[PDB]
Amino acid sequence: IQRTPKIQVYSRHPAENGKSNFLNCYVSGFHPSDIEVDLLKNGERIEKVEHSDLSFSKDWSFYLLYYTEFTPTEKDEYACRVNHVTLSQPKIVKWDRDM
Amino acid sequence: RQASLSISV
Amino acid sequence: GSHSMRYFFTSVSRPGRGEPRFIAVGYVDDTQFVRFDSDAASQRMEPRAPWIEQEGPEYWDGETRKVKAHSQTHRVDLGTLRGYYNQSEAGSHTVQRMYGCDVGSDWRFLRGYHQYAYDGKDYIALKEDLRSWTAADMAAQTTKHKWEAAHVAEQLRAYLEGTCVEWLRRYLENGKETLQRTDAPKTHMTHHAVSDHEATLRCWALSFYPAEITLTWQRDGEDQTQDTELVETRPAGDGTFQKWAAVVVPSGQEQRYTCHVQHEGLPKPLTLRW
């Protein structure tokens, strides 16, 4: 049984350019639990990234929250990069402040 | 507080 | 209000070298309060909520003993399951278990549960009567006969209706300031023009607790489902949750649409419109 991860990328607080905040990548609905998740700034991997303790839903699928401190700006692009056994190539989901 | 789960499948 | 205590356990075999990865988490409602990770340094059950920190050394000794013992039960299980299913020693497999109890608004027992999975599929589960077992297949049927002979359901029933409920009530009292507090969603609507003819309205619910919530769109006072999008409730990362619902509408007709928000923190539902 292999289930591909759903991905949401978003900020903890309402986003305003120039004000510190937290960048979240929430992955869910996946199986098995081994997964690679990185947060990106302008294509490059952010090094100080933490995550929640593995848990799961009613249907046994797993979920995890990856997060780091960040400051939104007009110039910088943020994204979440996910690899999993169900994916042939890493998926890149760009952060959209309206979602 | 947890229960004890000592019996295997 | 109405409440629950749940424990979640995951073990993942590592065929290349060493023992399985083991991660356990405990919750009261939507608040994590304890954790164990076999990869962590402490090798102890650790606190994750201020109100549990008051528990003394015999608590942490006992919980650590039980959680480490549970990890070894899963280690044995993974070997046995590989044999039941005639699988090779070369692949990685998963065992999962969840158990807990619900109480009513009067803090009395409502129901209990104990469910087990192998490789992400139902394997064996305790029925709502807390006396019988649901076995998914013939391997689980073998396990059922073993658990019957070992008086497993009797013990679980006693725990779920007793210890489980008693300690949940204890935690609810000790952590009253947060556990018995409801955080109503902070709500607002945004507008995103798509073209000369169409726009997206998005209804936001933020910083709420507990996680349970309903967002619905209406058009001229009737539920609308066409051209809507509803995202999964997601953690903010500070103990609270977020969710949104959106609808595509003809530009200039925005006033026809209303967003309706239901949450335990709200005495009556909220209605929003652009």
CATH class wording of the largest domain in chain C: Alpha Beta
Evaluate the radius of gyration of chain B: 8 Å
Quaternary structure state of the chains depicted: heterotrimer
CATH homologous superfamily name of the largest domain in chain C? Answer: MHC class I-like antigen recognition-like
Strand portion of chain B = under 5%
Largest sheet of chain B: none
Largest sheet of chain C: 8 strands, antiparallel
- The helix count of chain C comes to 5
Protein name (chain B): Serine/threonine-protein kinase D2
Family (chain B): Belongs to the protein kinase superfamily. CAMK Ser/Thr protein kinase family. PKD subfamily.
Organism (chain B): Homo sapiens (Human)
Subcellular location (chain B): Cytoplasm; Cell membrane; Nucleus; Golgi apparatus, trans-Golgi network
Secondary-structure map:
The complex is a heterotrimer of chains A (99), B (9) and C (274).
Chain A: E1 6-11, E2 21-30, E3 36-41, E4 44-45, E5 50-51, E6 55-56, E7 62-70, E8 78-83, E9 91-94
Antiparallel strand pairs in A: 1-2, 2-7, 3-4, 3-8, 5-7, 6-7, 8-9
Chain B: no helix or strand
Chain C: E1 3-12, E2 21-28, E3 31-37, E4 46-47, H1 57-84, E5 94-103, E6 109-118, E7 121-126, E8 133-135, H2 138-149, H3 152-161, H4 163-174, H5 176-179, E9 186-193, E10 198-208, E11 214-219, E12 222-224, E13 228-230, E14 234-235, E15 241-250, E16 257-262, E17 270-272
Helix pairs in contact in C: 3-4
Structure description:
Chain A has 99 residues and is mostly beta strands. Chain A has strands at residues 6-11, 21-30, 36-41, 44-45, 50-51, 55-56, 62-70, 78-83, 91-94. In chain A, 0% of the residues lie in helices and 47% in strands. Helix content of chain B is 0%, strand content 0%. The N and C termini of chain B lie far apart (23 Å). By secondary structure, chain C is α+β, with helices and mostly antiparallel strands. Chain C contains 5 helices and 17 strands. Chain C has helices at 57-84, 138-149, 152-161, 163-174, 176-179; strands at 3-12, 21-28, 31-37, 46-47, 94-103, 109-118, 121-126, 133-135, 186-193, 198-208, 214-219, 222-224, 228-230, 234-235, 241-250, 257-262, 270-272. In chain C, α3 (152-161) runs parallel beside α4 (163-174). At the A-C interface, β1, β2, β6 and β7 of A face β1, β3, β5 and β14 of C. Chain C: Residues 91-182 are annotated as: Alpha-2.
